[PDB]
Amino acid sequence: PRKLLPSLKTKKPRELVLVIGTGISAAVAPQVPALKSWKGLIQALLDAAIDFDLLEDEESKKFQKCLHEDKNLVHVAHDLIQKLSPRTSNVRSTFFKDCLYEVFDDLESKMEDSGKQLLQSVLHLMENGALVLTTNFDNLLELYAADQGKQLESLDLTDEKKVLEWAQEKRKLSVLHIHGVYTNPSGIVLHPAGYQNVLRNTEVMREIQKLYENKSFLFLGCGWTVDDTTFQALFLEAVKHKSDLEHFMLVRRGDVDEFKKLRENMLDKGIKVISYGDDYADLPEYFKRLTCEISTRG
Amino acid sequence: PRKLLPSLKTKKPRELVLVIGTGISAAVAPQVPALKSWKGLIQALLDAAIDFDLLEDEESKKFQKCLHEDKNLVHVAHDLIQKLSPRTSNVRSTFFKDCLYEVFDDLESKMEDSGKQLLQSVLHLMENGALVLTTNFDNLLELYAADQGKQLESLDLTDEKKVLEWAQEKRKLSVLHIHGVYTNPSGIVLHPAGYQNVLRNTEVMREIQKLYENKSFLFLGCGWTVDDTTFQALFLEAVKHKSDLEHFMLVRRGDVDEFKKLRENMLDKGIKVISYGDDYADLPEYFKRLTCEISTRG
């Protein structure tokens, strides 16, 4: 198989900042449309909007029409967010709560060991002291973290005190959601202009330079992530040094052409490349070894 | 066994300049491919390149193809160096660092007393004040030198100031690597034209005559180093006196024919022959005696 990663073995778990994307959510049993892919997310919220009649026939037809010939997924998800927000004050919004909390539940009932190893290694990293952020609305990881008895809370960008106090890292055992959480419907912001107004403080992205300048990330199930504008604006807007980065990322192998294409474009971004077997079943053993040597040397 | 060397006994250890080659690295437990033989080094790098996918299948196939029907081993190692160097600026080159630092580690875990006596007597020679240079990429000797508490630095030909102040022998307790070191990936140069441009100063090779003209070397695990072109380029190009040399070299005995052919050819070069017992086990006692008598008379 693929042996121990050269750099990863010697990095301290403190500097390790794990990032989880659609790959880990797809490691969970793929029967919920929300977790197979990002495309199946918007399809899931569609099916939830049609069956719960939040949205009349013609405009569900429009949003479906976006699906076949598609472009600009994040804008379309934002157009959705905007059209489902005519609410007055709170009114326990049935246009929001009763769609996201329909789509993103029924998740635990389809949990197996093959995805379970991922988050148990994650709990090993957190008990080492590693910081973790995610890119999905789901909340399965911290639910099963609470399953064995480790309380893990969901954070967002709306709560200013928690974001301000989270950048300095004193609050360990905490996972920030760069997109949102279904357990807190008022805490999701996705449009590019929505996370800029709450981040009006230029001193608080001075407090985020400690993530990208010095701390080491590890993008799991990513790569299309570095393509959309959210990570460019939260990571690469306020830093001009691509010559000396310490960030890492893990994806599948496959056809050699896109292999070298991703190689070159995220060397231009400045992350290291790791592709191992595209077998969908050697990532568990490889990543759980990674975590255990990290914990032992840590 | 083989008693004390007639000439060596009376040499003061300052005149002694120890050279270590593939024999000492093979004295270490021979299960890393890198240290059993020079041949074994390039296959270790080839195996590292295949499993980490620096080169595609066909390039690795060509590289494998040179192995079976071989020639120009240093030339092929340079071809490997050139094709693994498309990097931009530094970019913590994954084509170099993540290959050499994979191959040349996992070395200390296989360290035993039979190889330990060699380096511990080496430490004796250093505390006498002898000079030592190496011909292999490894840094096991300096690592275990630092094990008991003696700090030993790895030097190369790239840093011009260190090489300039090193030829005078003002800097003691220092070891240059005629080939390179794995702890400094940017400090390795092997192709014949690489160590001439950095050595553009003919006055600095005039500062090198004090090695070959007056200082006494002692080549351990050598004999094939006087066959390739690096030793001839750095030693015999600027020296025209083979009538009066003062240099030594130690190797195995064996077939009498090959014994006398090496005898004659390196008498033509101008070194003394010592072949003892090819038992792979009386070199420790013989060389450790040699070193203790030199230290006592030093």
Author numbering:
A (entry chain C), B (entry chain B): 28 to 325
Source paper text:
Here we identify family with sequence similarity 118 member B (FAM118B) and FAM118A—two understudied vertebrate proteins—as vertebrate-specific sirtuins with similarities to bacterial antiphage sirtuins. We show that human FAM118B forms head-to-tail filaments both in vitro and in living human cells, a feature that appears to be conserved in both FAM118B and its paralog FAM118A across vertebrates. While human FAM118B and FAM118A have individually very weak NAD-processing activity in vitro, their interaction leads to markedly increased activity, suggesting a tightly regulated system. As expected, the FAM118B sirtuin domain comprises the large Rossmann-fold subdomain and a small α-helical subdomain but lacks a zinc-binding module.
We recombinantly produced and purified full-length FAM118B (referred to simply as FAM118B) and its slightly truncated variant lacking poorly conserved and likely flexible terminal regions (designated FAM118B24–334), both with a noncleavable His6 tag. To perform cryoEM reconstruction, we treated filament fragments composed of several protomers as a single particle. This approach produced electron density maps of FAM118B filament fragments composed of five and two protomers, at 5.0-Å and 4.1-Å resolution, respectively (both obtained using a focused refinement in the last step), and of FAM118B24–334 filament fragments composed of six protomers at 7.8-Å resolution (without focused refinement) and two protomers at 4.8-Å resolution (with focused refinement). The final structures of all individual protomers of both FAM118B and FAM118B24–334 are similar to each other and align well with the AF3 model. Individual FAM118B protomers are arranged into filaments in our cryoEM maps. Both FAM118B and FAM118B24–334 structures show essentially the same assembly where each successive protomer is translated forward and rotated by approximately 40° around the longitudinal axis, creating a helical arrangement.
